[PDB]
Paper text:
Muramidases (N-acetylmuramide glycanhydrolases), also known as lysozymes, cleave the bacterial cell wall peptidoglycan component at the β-1,4-glycosidic bond between N-acetylmuramic acid (NAM) and N-acetylglucosamine (NAG) in the carbohydrate backbone. The characterized enzymes from GH25 exhibit both β-1,4-N-acetyl- and β-1,4-N,6-O-diacetylmuramidase activities, cleaving the β-1,4-glycosidic bond between N-acetylmuramic acid (NAM) and N-acetylglucosamine (NAG) moieties in the carbohydrate backbone of bacterial peptidoglycan. The first half of the barrel, where the active site residues are located, is a classical barrel which is consistent with the idea that the initial ancient fold was a half-barrel which became an eight stranded barrel by gene duplication, with more sequence conservation in the half that contains the catalytic residue and less sequence (and as seen here structure) conservation in the other half which is responsible for binding specific targets. It is proposed that, as previously suggested for other GH25 muramidases, that Asp95 acts as an acid donating a proton to the glycosidic oxygen of the substrate, with the N-acetyl group of the substrate rather than a second protein carboxylate acting as the enzymatic nucleophile to stabilise the oxocarbenium ion-like transition state.
Residue numbers in the entry: 1 to 208
Write the structure that this text describes.
């Protein structure tokens, strides 16, 4: 396993030299939400990661009732979720989880939610060349997608569960790619494991 972490504009402070000294090797950084929100911290964070030897990616907080999946993939890819084959850029991640402003599944049916996610990931791949990572929880995914297996053979899984073991994965995935295992990164943020060695992390960044 390889350690890493994730941050958003909630975290005032990230010393990436200190993080690299801690042994962390990758970081995900919030870029966008919906079609209107761009994190004001993203550029400082993504630059700091770059300058201090990190493999890094961006994530998008999905708002499935607000606009299409395609519109949000375009907004994300234009505002921090772009990719390049430099060995240090992770594919962008779709953070698709509990509605932070209301009912957990955003008022969508399960099949409508699957279609929304499909629209996001197909659009993101058409723009960037990469299938996005999907960040979710097994319980949200079960309730809101009907535990769909539709994305597992394209989209690496970033599963969240703050427990001593990863627990049951959503349908279709044989393994996690990333596991968010606490919300207690020492400098602020969440802690992740990558399920593989350095060669495999580089292959995920390279897309091959």
């Amino acid at each position: 396993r390889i350690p890493g972490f994730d941050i958003s504009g909630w975290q005032p402070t990230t010393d990436f030299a200190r993080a690299y000294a801690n042994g962390d090797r990758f970081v995900y950084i919030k870029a966008t939400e919906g079609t209107t929100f761009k994190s004001s911290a993203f550029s400082r964070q993504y630059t700091g990661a770059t300058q201090n030897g990190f493999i890094r990616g961006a994530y998008h907080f999905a708002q499935p009732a607000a606009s299409s999946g395609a519109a949000q993939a375009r907004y994300f890819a234009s505002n921090g979720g772009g990719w390049s084959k430099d060995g240090i850029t992770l594919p962008g991640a779709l953070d698709i989880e509990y509605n932070p402003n209301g009912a957990t599944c955003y008022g969508l049916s399960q099949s409508a939610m699957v279609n929304w996610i499909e629209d996001f990931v197909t659009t993101y791949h058409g723009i960037t060349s990469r299938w996005p990572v999907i960040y979710t929880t097994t319980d949200w995914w079960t309730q809101c997608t009907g535990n769909s297996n539709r994305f597992a053979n394209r989209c690496p899984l970033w599963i969240a569960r703050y427990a001593s073991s990863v627990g049951t994965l959503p349908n279709g995935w044989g393994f996690y790619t990333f596991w968010q295992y606490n919300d207690k990164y020492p400098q602020g943020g969440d802690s992740n494991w990558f399920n593989g060695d350095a060669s495999r992390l580089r292959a995920l960044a390279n897309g091959d």
